[PDB]
Symmetry: C3
């Protein structure tokens, strides 16, 4: 079979047609799995959870477990995972809490490496890479294309901007703006992620605008509001700069300087 007979499938679970589930894995009550998704051996899936299409989940992962957050109380919170995602060895993904969104969400095309953690109520976009042991504490929003190097730690409620980059062992306590590169414990702003922008084919005009934007924010001594005003123009001209400006505007715990 596509479904190993040593696996355990709750009667209430709903598996699309070509789903593979390896030996000694558990697909629990109210778990929904979508077409082309391959579940490895030794995998614990718990619900209520919805996993889309063409995903890949490796051994020793715990996807859809209750958060150990002391506030959570057995409520029927959820987890939503999209399509084309890779979940590697021993990754842990917890479901949401009623105190927030009552949902934890992961989009599409994400690569989530071994022993990474995705805490309750987290929101991961698309095309993100979480390298080994990257941990998102809770209520963490990671926007499209971000890359978090191994053992990057993200404090609860922090937002990780689109196309951003973290060096290995970074400890992020504040919001990381879109395109920014951070390193260290505590994490510190270094520059922008030009390598990402290039691997992605951003235009030279956008890069140049991104580069001036950085200065306005980090190098000219403005308070954040002074900064946001000065970017109005370029944010009106360049969408890339608007994403940047927006990411700074939505910061609740401040920005990583």
């Amino acid at each position: 079979s596509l479904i190993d007979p040593r696996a355990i499938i709750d009667p209430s679970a709903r598996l699309a047609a070509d789903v593979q589930v390896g030996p000694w894995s558990i697909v629990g009550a109210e778990v929904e799995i979508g077409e082309g998704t391959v579940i490895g051996p030794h995998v614990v899936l718990k619900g209520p959870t919805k996993i889309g299409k063409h995903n890949r989940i490796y051994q020793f992962s715990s996807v859809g477990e209750d958060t150990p957050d002391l506030k959570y109380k057995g409520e029927p919170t959820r987890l939503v995972i999209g399509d084309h995602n890779v979940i590697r060895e021993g990754v842990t993904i917890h479901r949401g809490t009623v105190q927030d969104r009552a949902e934890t969400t992961i989009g599409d095309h994400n690569l989530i490496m071994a022993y990474a953690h995705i805490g309750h109520d987290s929101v991961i976009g698309n095309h993100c890479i979480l390298v080994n042991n990257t941990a998102l504490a809770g209520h963490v929003h990671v926007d499209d294309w971000a890359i978090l190097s191994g053992y990057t730690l993200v404090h609860q409620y922090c937002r990780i901007g689109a196309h951003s980059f973290s060096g290995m062992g970074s400890a992020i306590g504040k919001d990381v703006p879109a395109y920014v590169t951070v390193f260290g414990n505590p994490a510190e702003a270094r520059s922008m992620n030009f390598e990402g922008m290039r691997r992605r084919g951003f235009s030279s005009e956008a890069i140049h605008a991104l580069r001036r934007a950085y200065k306005v924010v980090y190098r000219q001594g403005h308070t954040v509001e002074e900064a946001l005003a000065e970017l109005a123009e370029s944010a009106a001209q360049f969408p890339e700069v608007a994403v940047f400006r927006d990411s700074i505007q939505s910061a609740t715990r401040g920005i990583t300087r």
Copy 2:
């Protein structure tokens, strides 16, 4: 209650209402108390005593031998109390013959995914060890302390009651009670006022703790001096007494 795909050793002892999920191993000389819930894919090894109403999650290794190229299999122990939560992939090692010969965990502790509790460590009650917190060995964690994600604790260190580490802290020296530490290497920052409030500490006790911080950290005093200077406040406030005592017992220095 006890899944037939699990392997229960004949010398293992299970109290009533114990559950054991599939493909778990409850080895020789493991004793499990009443109400305890063990997940699937758990390895319990002994000699080990687990109390009541505990919950242990999948991929955990509880009661394993401390690593070594050597296969020295002494009868050292692990003792775990009641109402503890042990999450995914937690490693907990038994003690060493040279030392206490026992690793000890109290009650109402929360030990999050992939934390490690090294041989001969002692955890009290109401402690939280957030993800990937690692206790090297011979570590003593007193009541209500909180170690944030990826906190590393060097061997022989004492983590004081009600203390707090920020995420990714590397602790190489005793953390006095109530103290908050950050960084690698870890440094003292302030007192855990957030914790003290959540636990209903009196405003009087909190101000006295705040003042005691300065006596130890910001007035240039020696310790024999700080402690002499603390003696009176300690007598009035049992909370200050815990603090003073944590500092007095700091044999190989305090995190400054």
Copy 3:
């Protein structure tokens, strides 16, 4: 010896006294040598060669494909020697065609829980990787090196023989032989005199190495100047020659 709940692919090759615990998978093209003990809940994938008298603990993934977006299904290898101990949850990945197409590990290595050995890394002999030590890829670790818990090693770096890293070190450049490093980012501190004594080095060799360290790290020389200055004691002392050679081979920077 081979538990009937384990899964052994027809193509695997196992030595006579190989033990395999329950719920382990020995996949296609895996070879296991005499006296090796595979625990329960182990995933082994190939092509992989495992030598003799090894110990692989539970929840380990040995011989998986690297998640490197560059790897594309090719049949790269992993070779592991003898007398190794691989603890709980260790991940070891096979090589890439972009490099050596092989991940390699020698003999007498102690690889502790949740450590990661990335694609194309090479490990020598008598090394100790403490809990959650992670080699990113294309890392070379030379004999007798000790990496303390949560040591991160950046891809392409070389860890020299008898070197030591403090816990939570983040290593981005090569670490010369014998050198001790600490912190994030990692920095050189002194020489692993423990290791030298522990390993029967003569007091004459030790003084020369101590002298060698001063030459490279304390006198304001350039690497080339420093290398030249060492030639003599390198000729006289093979221990020093290991030190000089590690610095020489430091293509892209030594840790300072």
